[PDB]
Amino acid sequence: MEHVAFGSEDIENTLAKMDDGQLDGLAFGAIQLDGDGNILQYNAAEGDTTGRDPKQVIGKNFFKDVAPCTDSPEFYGKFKEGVASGNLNTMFEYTFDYQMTPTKVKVHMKKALSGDSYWVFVKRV
Ligand SMILES: *C(=O)/C=C/c1ccc(O)cc1
Structure with a gap:
């Protein structure tokens, strides 16, 4: 396991340019999206939490097809605000419930x- 904590102040530096294999070594789920929400990276911890196959979701749109429960002001709306300003940094609890047991994170x-x-990082609560 890579020795990085969820919420660490410099997480974007420690994960900068990490390959798919290194991302698979984290204690928490890690997704990388482009500014439209297309999935660029998706780690093993996230697949174990959500059921998605980390290999299959690459290239899909997170808000339109993988995670429609996040297509809302409280998730997608906050994401696109932070993309537009260039300073996205928000931490919040949420429930994931599309074709899965509702899972609070x-x-x-x-x-x-x-x-x-x-980045979208995810741990269970
Ligand atoms: C709601 O539809 C959430 C779905 C979801 C969240 C996170 C993932 O990694 C995959 C699906």
Whole structure:
């Protein structure tokens, strides 16, 4: 396991340019999205939490097809506000319930250092 904590102040630096295998070593779920919500990276911890196959979701749109329960002001709305300003950094609890047992989580979305890239981190509560 990579020694990185959820919510760490410099998480975007420690995860900067991490390959898919390194991301698979985290204690929490980690998704990377482009500014439209298309999935660029998706780690093993997230797949174990949600049931999605980390290999199959790459290239799908998170808000339109994988996670319609997040297509709301409280998730997607906050995401796109932070994309537009270039300073996305919000941590909030949420329930994931599309074609799955409703699963309550803490979400941390934060701008990544790479261009047109935004992290969504997820742990259970
Ligand atoms: C609501 O539809 C949430 C779905 C979901 C959240 C997070 C994932 O990694 C996959 C699906």
